[PDB]
Amino acid sequence: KSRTSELAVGIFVIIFGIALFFLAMKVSGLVGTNLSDGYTMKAQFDNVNGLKPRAKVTMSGVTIGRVDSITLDPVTRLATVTFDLDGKLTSFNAEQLKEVQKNALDELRYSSDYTQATPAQQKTMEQQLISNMNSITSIDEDAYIMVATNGLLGEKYLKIVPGGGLNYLKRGDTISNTQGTMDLEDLISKFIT
Amino acid sequence: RTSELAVGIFVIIFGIALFFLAMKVSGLVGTNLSDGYTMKAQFDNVNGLKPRAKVTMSGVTIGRVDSITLDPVTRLATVTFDLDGKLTSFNAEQLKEVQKNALDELRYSS
Amino acid sequence: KRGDTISNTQGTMDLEDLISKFIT
Amino acid sequence: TSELAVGIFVIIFGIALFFLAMKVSGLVGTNLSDGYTMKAQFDNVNGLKPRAK
Amino acid sequence: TSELAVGIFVIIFGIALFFLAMKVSGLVGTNLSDGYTMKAQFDNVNGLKPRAK
Amino acid sequence: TIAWLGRLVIERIRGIGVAALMLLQIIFSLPSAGGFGRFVYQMHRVGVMSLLIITVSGLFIGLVLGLQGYSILVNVGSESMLGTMVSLTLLRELAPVVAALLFAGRAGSALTAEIGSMKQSEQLASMEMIGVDPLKQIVSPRLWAGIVSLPMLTVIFAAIGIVGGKLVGVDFLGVDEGSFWSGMQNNVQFGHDVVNGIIKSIVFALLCTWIAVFQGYACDPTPEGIATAMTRTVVYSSLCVLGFDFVLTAVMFG
Amino acid sequence: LLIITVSGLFIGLVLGLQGYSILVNVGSESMLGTMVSLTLLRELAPVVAALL
Amino acid sequence: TVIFAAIGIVGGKLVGVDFLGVDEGSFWSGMQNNVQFGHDVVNGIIKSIVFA
């Protein structure tokens, strides 16, 4: 019965390795997955009272991303919050991008002054203004961020308010225009007392 | 022996009689055969909305929110909306009545 | 009829504007 | 082997303390001392409780 | 052969004993941080819990 | 000294390899349909004979959940919460585990003991010379009775647990039938609160019965081995149910 | 000890995940402490341990 | 029984607080609020003497 022995171990190793894989893989349905294209962004704030890691991010009320980390800079007194946004929702489809690239340039060359530039300069501007868009998402130049509340009880989350700009921010950059929350004793000090 | 198999059969029957109780507990959802009607709607903000949120006309339940997505170049939300047509489609008599009223007026005002 | 788009817009309103409506 | 049983069972005891002390910390209550009783009169204690602070 | 039995003995055996202790103390009572302390007066700490942020 | 553990581990794991091979043969090829008409008999000893235990335990679990739920829920929402918690607890976590372990006990040790004796007495072995493959004649209907029986028992356990919960939570302790029933309908979806209980039940039924057959059909023909096999089938299927329950629930509701 | 320890770890992790997926619909996560402790101390340790 | 619960609580925290984003302070506070060593732990033990 010496010959059967070997085969038995080989079967074990394979069935067992599969079982280990199954566990490691299947649990990813809930833990360890970003569920996104992975672009990140930064922003700074004056008051982030009641945010949590894993609070939602939205545009127009559509879930668009996650708040990953919160940290304080001790010499500026500002909080820094890091985002994780999903490219499938924030990037432009390439066909849509063609439209975006072209209408952005029409405003930049005709409402603004690129057509008055040396034609060589005009081409240079168009070439890099557009090749730079291979690095962008839909959030424009004037987009706000502010912290948001969820329900009349619940955890605090982050809101993006787009619109009115021409150019776009590159993934990895910092959104500059931000506004902080209000604490309860200071709604009171501002409007009641 | 039949004295042993009669029971083997019995247990499955029992096993069904209390299956039903499980269905009374979950209730009936996901209706109805005239499901096909779906609708689209545009919104500026959908912050608290969810898949499986209910839909109403005058408070009667008539449908479900199925999917919420963003259009990145219009910056609008678009909602995929299952309208349970069983309660919104006209039956033949009812159709004749709305149809007649609307046709009578169509050829009077135009 | 069938599956058209309802031709009307009316979204929700956040505590942001419920508050901005008034000055504090 | 009896020597192993003796040299090994001590582990269930080392483990018993480690986890029991953890349990005390996780659910530690209030250790009162030098307590006194006092009484006071009231007109209404609606919804006051037998273990209130 | 003992070549394999010895390698098999060490794996898991030498992991599991430490594993049980470290995966508990790191969660229930052993820690390390560069902590500093400060004191303050208050007139009325109503309801502030001992573990508040 | 130390190498002893080494050898123990190596051999136990070899055995799992063997079990996998056995399972493949029993499920892979079963052409003898004419003899499978008897599995309905076999079911008598797995399914029919186990309702008493599953039923009694289901009632006690339902009543206990009722009382503990209530003493916590009076501070939060018993009117709405007894319904939702009794039904979700039984459908998601307890019918698939409590019934699975009671079954592993009552059917599992009995089944392994029976195969064990078939082997120890040499009775089983005598079939090889008659040309009747014992896997198709002895093992097949036992493994199948296990697959069908546990899932049906799992449903009954929950059905009784609901009766138990209501019997104390609503009828002795002062709660509305209306909100109990509607609460359950509002939060319990067939898809997938009832369905996931059933899926987990199938997984456990296969894993647990598979082990009971495998250990009963032991290598070493020594009387001491029957008692050892019985203890081991309870221990191994018990840990496997808990291990797999964790992963499956993690996916289903995560 | 080995069997009871492995069982305790899986039960703990299961309660954690089931509690959480219910609590996120209350929005009250402080309950993980309160419920993991009460469930194990009052009903499961005395029953799961007794049955294993 | 005690060891089982102890492992179970730790397993609970390990996922409930450490993987799932719950502020830890509320976990330990939630345990103290309101289950106690002198009551609920004691009843868990009494039941285990009976079962043993």
Three-state SS string across A106-169, please?
Answer: HHHHHHCCHHHCCHHHHHHHHHHHHHHHHHEEEEECCCEEEEECCCCCCCEEEEEECCCCCCEE
CB contacts of E4 in chain F (<8 Å) are: 6, 10
E6 CB neighbours in chain F (<8 A) are: 2-3, 6
Q: Distance (Å) from the C-alpha of residue F17 to the closest C-alpha of chain A?
A: 4
Contact G19, F93 (CB under 8 A): no
Cβ of residue F227 closer than 8 Å to a chain E Cβ: no
Residues F60, F62, F68, F74, CA torsion sign: negative
Sign for the pseudo-dihedral over CA of B107, B110, C2, C6: negative
Please answer yes or no on whether F193 and B21 come within 8 Å at the CB atom. Answer: no
Alpha helices (H) in chain F, listed in sequence order: 3-28, 39-42, 51-73, 78-88, 100-103, 110-120, 134, 140-169, 177-187, 195-216, 224-252
Fill in the DSSP letter of residue F43.
G
How far apart CA H34 and CA F97 sit, in angstroms, is 29
Cα–Cα distance, B96 to B102 (Å, whole number): 10
CB F208 within 8 A of CB F101: no
Instruction: Give yes or no for a contact between F110 and F229, defined as CB atoms under 8 angstroms apart.
Output: no
- Which tokens belong to B63? 């449908």
Q: Are the CB atoms for F146 and F216 separated by under 8 Å?
A: no
Q: G11-37 burial, b for 16+ CB within 10 Å, e for fewer?
A: bbbbbbbbbbbbbeeeeebbbbbbbbb
Q: Do H3 and D23 touch (CB under 8 A)?
A: no
Alpha carbons G45 and F98: distance in angstroms, whole number: 14
Give the residue among F3, D12, F198, A155 at the shortest CA–CA distance from B23.
F198
Contact between chains at F159 and B27 (C-beta distance less than 8 A): no
Centroid of chain to Cα E36: 20
Note the Cα H33 to chain centre separation in Å. Answer: 12
Residue H16 near residue H22, CB atoms below 8 Å: yes
Sign of CA dihedral G30, G33, G36, G42: negative
- Kindly tell me the burial class for residue H30, based on how many C-beta atoms sit within 10 Å of its own C-beta (0-12, 13-18, 19 or more): buried
Side chain identity at residue B37, one-letter code: Y
Give first-to-last CA distance, chain G, whole Å.
Answer: 11
Q: Would you call the peptide bond into H34 cis, given omega within 30 degrees of 0 as the criterion?
A: yes
Q: What is the CA radius of gyration of chain E?
A: 23
- State the virtual CA torsion across F93, G8, H33, F83 in degrees, nearest 10: 10
Per DSSP, what are the bridge partners of residue A180? none
Of C4, C11, C14, nearest to B43 by CB-CB distance is C11
- Pair of tokens at residue A132: 């730079």
Contact, F77 vs F93, CB < 8 A?
no
Four-point Cα dihedral F134, F117, F17, F19, nearest 10: 60
Measure E31 CA to nearest chain F CA, in Å: 29
CA-wise closest residue to A156 among A91, A73, A79: A79
Q: Which residues pair with H47 in a beta bridge?
A: none
**Beta-carbon-side half-sphere exposure of residue B59 (alpha carbons within 13 Å):** 0
Q: Check CB contact of H40 with chain D, cutoff 8 Å.
A: yes
Chain B, residues 19-38, CB within 8 A of chain F, namely 19, 21-27, 29-30
Q: Which residue of chain G comes nearest to F76, CA vs CA? A: G26
Nearest Cα to F216, choosing from F119, F147, F100, F122?
A: F119
Of the candidates A144, A145, A146, A139, the residue with the CA atom closest to the CA atom of residue A167 = A139
Alpha carbon distance F233, F213 (integer Å): 9
What token pair was written down for H26? 């509320």
Answer yes or no: are the C-beta atoms of G2 and G52 closer than 8 Å: no
Q: Is E47 within 8 Å of chain H by CB? A: no
Name the residue type at position H3: I
Contacts of F250 (CB under 8 A, 6+ apart): A26, A27, A29, A30, A31, G14, G17
In chain H, the residue whose alpha carbon lies closest to the alpha carbon of D28 is H37
Please give the structure tokens belonging to residue B49.
């909305």
Rounded (10°) CA dihedral G34, G37, G38, G41: -170
CA–CA gap between residue B52 and residue F73 (Å, rounded):
27
Query: What single-letter amino acid sits at F77?
Result: G
Burial of residue F150 (number of CB atoms within 10 Å: 0-12, 13-18, 19+):
buried
Q: Do the Cβ atoms of H37 and D15 come within 8 Å?
A: no
Q: What counts of helices (H) and strands (E) characterise chain H? A: 3, 0
Chains touching chain H, criterion 3+ CB pairs below 8 Å: A, D, E, G
C-alpha torsion angle, residues F40, F45, F51, F56 (rounded to 10): -170
Residue A145's DSSP bridge partners are: A160, A178
Using CA of residue A10, residue A12, residue A15, residue A21, what is the dihedral sign?
negative
Please check whether residue F5 touches E, CB under 8 A.
yes
Short-list F198, G21, F176, CA closest to B22 = F198
Q: How far apart are CA F241 and CA F203, in angstroms?
A: 9
Residue A139 has a CB neighbour count (10 Å cut-off) of 26
**Which of A7, A10, A29 is nearest residue F254 as measured by Cβ atoms?**
A29
H or E element, residue E45: none
Q: Tokens 């104390």 correspond to what residue?
A: F168
Q: For residues B95 and B103, what is the distance between their CA atoms, to the nearest angstrom?
A: 12
Size of chain C, expressed as the number of residues it contains: 24
Among H37, D21, F94, which residue's Cα sits nearest to residue H45? Answer: H37
Q: Which residues of D touch G1 (CB under 8 A)?
A: 12, 15
For H10, the closest of E27, E51, E52 (CB atoms) is E27
Q: Is G3 on the interface with D (CB under 8 A)?
A: no
C with F: touching (≥3 Cβ pairs within 8 Å): no
Q: What is the CA radius of gyration of chain B?
A: 24
Amino acid at residue number F24: L
| Phi, psi torsion values for D49, nearest 5 degrees | -125, 150
Q: Identify all chain G residues contacting A153, using CB atoms and an 8 Å cutoff.
A: 27
Task: Provide the token pair at B61.
Answer: 């339940």
Resolution number, Å: 3.9
Q: Do A53 and H19 touch (CB under 8 A)?
A: no
SS3 string, chain D, reads CHHHHHHHHHHHHHHHHHHHHHHHHHCCCCCCCCCCCCCCCCCCCCCCCCCCC
Q: Give all chains having 3 or more CB-to-CB distances under 8 Å with chain G.
A: A, D, F, H
Q: How many residues does chain G have?
A: 52
Q: From C8, which residue of chain B is nearest by alpha-carbon distance?
A: B42
Angle at A74 between CA A72 and CA A78, to 5 degrees: 50
